[PDB]
Each structure stands twice: as C-alpha cells, then as structure tokens.
Write a protein that binds this ligand. Sequence first.
Ligand code: 5OJ
Ligand code: K
Ligand code: K
Ligand code: ZN
Length: 358
Amino acid sequence: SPITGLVYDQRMMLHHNMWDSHHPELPQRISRIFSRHEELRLLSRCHRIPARLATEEELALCHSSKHISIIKSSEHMKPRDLNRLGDEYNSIFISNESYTCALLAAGSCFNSAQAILTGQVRNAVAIVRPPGHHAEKDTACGFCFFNTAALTARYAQSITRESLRVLIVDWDVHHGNGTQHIFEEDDSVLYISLHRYEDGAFFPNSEDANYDKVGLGKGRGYNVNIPWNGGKMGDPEYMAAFHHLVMPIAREFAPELVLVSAGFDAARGDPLGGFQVTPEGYAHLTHQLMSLAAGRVLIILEGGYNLTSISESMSMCTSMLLGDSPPSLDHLTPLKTSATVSINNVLRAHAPFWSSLR
Ligand SMILES: O=C(NO)c1ccc(CC(=O)N(CCO)c2ccccc2)cc1
Ligand SMILES: [K+]
Ligand SMILES: [K+]
Ligand SMILES: [Zn+2]
C-alpha cells in the first residue's frame, strides 16, 4: 500500500497569542508548511486524510480529568481570565480557540495512525499545531496543551492490541518531558529524544533530560535521552547519534509503528534552537526511520519557528516518505568532542539494556 497520507486543517490556525501577534509559535507555521507542500507538488502526490476532533475519552488515555476540564473551560473565558490562566503555566498562552485546535491536532493524528495501521496508507505526515511533547498528564507547558504524540501511541494500541510496540523518536531541539514521563514505566513504548541540554540549563531546564534517566521498573531501558552540551550541533552529530544509538536500539526493539515528534527548531535559521541541522539532514533521518516497522511511520509537527526553515525541512521529510531518493549530504566533519562525550555517555548508560550496542 505504497501511499503517503497527509493531514492538515486550517482551523488549527485559530489558536493565537492575543497580546503578541508576533509570538514565535505563529498560526502561519502550519499554513506556510502546507503551501510549500503545494508548490513542490508533494501534496498532490499524497492521500489526503481528514482531520477530526479528539474526544474527551481519548484525551483521558494520557491526561487527568482535572487537566482536561481546566483547558476545556478556557473556551468560554474573557480575555483577562485567559491571561491569568495562561500565567499559571510555564510558557503558555491561551485563546478561546486553543482547546479546539488542541483537539484537532490530536484527532488529526489519530486518523493518520488509523490509516497506517489498517493499511490504507504506508506512512503519513501531520501538519498540526499547537505542539504536544512538553504537555504532561496533569499540566500544560511550553506551548503544549495535550501530548499529541503520547495520545497517538495509546490510541494506536487501543485500536490494535495493548502490547503494540510503538517507537517515539523526538528530534525537536527540546526534551519532550511530558512524553518521557507518560511512558517512563512502560516497556511497550520506546521513547528516544535528542535535545539541547547544556547541563540542565536549556528549556525545560530539568535533569530529567539527562542520559542517566533510562526508565523505571519494567520501563528500564525504554527511555533513551541523548543530551547535547557545548553549543551548536549539526548534521554530523545527528547522523552519528542515529548510527551509534537510535537505529541499533530501534532495530533491537522491533517497533510496529514509528511516531516522530518532529520539531524543526534544531534547524539552521531557528533562533530558539541555535543548531544547524539542514533540510537534507532531516531527509536522511526520515529515510533511516523508514527502514523500521515495515515502513509504518507518522511524522508529527512539534516546534520549529523559522517559517522558511520548517517549510523546507518538513517538505524534505514528506518527499522521503513518498519514496524519493535521499539528497546528497555534504562532507560530514569529525564530531565536536562534546558530541562524542554525549554519545559515549548514552552508550555506557544503555549497554546493560541493549545487547546490540557496541
Ligand atoms: O516548544 C518549544 N520549542 O519547540 C518551546 C517551548 C518553550 C519555550 C520557552 C523558552 O524557552 N524561553 C526561554 C528562551 O530563552 C522563554 C521565553 C519567553 C518567556 C518564557 C520562556 C520555547 C520553545
Ligand atoms: K527532542
Ligand atoms: K518508555
Ligand atoms: Zn522545541
């Protein structure tokens, strides 16, 4: 079924910051990504998957009733009360349409996972906002209300079987604290994150993101953090992390579905990330993941704030999903010594759990 699905809905643009029309998490992130897909004739090659609202019962797969009800209630708030509610969270703005856009983003991803798991398509891309991976069971954080990726893994298990093996690869420049916590005790969902860490000083500013956090109880080994220290990283570092860590661990895990928390704020041009991963870089990461899970890959937009960088990067990913050949990747410099230390720290930490690690 060599078809690639694409899901996008303009209604997700309604979510906005009422006090700063220029806030980085712009409604125009998704519309510019979508337009580039059109221009490059990628959209027309895809099977268009309908967006939908997630239900409250689906939200409850990962989130508490209290958290759901609080975010639901913002739908009817006056502007000053929205400001106050948003200030109760770390790095959140809320509008009357926020709840609905968050529901659309999750339901769009559920329909995509269903299309893949029932064989209607091989793989899919979801152009959605607001993002999800900083969201926790009981709280909103870092522009995220509900954890779209976490929900989707659980949704997928719910329409297949409880023990469906799901891999979540999170290449957003920030650590997905919410995703790690939701599955920390879980051995059916393998969470792998690459992220700027700087010894805990980079958002979300927690030692939860370090390499030594390997999972808990039966989930021991099923949480893989690859923290970057010492400034700018690029294609050389990310390709080396995939070669030595991500792809060997993923092959041993043998996932049946791969979800990508695909933020593009590690891209060159992005002020919030400060890294230099190129669009060709992201193409190669995507292409490697396609060798897993009989090709069952869902790419889900997280962060990424340079409108041109994210449009070109995510388009490049969809092109790989569609079966185009990978672009030339420039002379991969020897790694920064810092990156080498990071990769060796993860290798040492995970040697007890993954026999295939050399
Ligand atoms: O999802 C994200 N990036 O993909 C993301 C999540 C959270 C942030 C916040 C964040 O990182 N910062 C600090 C920037 O140096 C911040 C800025 C202004 C006000 C409050 C905090 C930035 C990005
Ligand atoms: K990440
Ligand atoms: K896990
Ligand atoms: Zn991010």
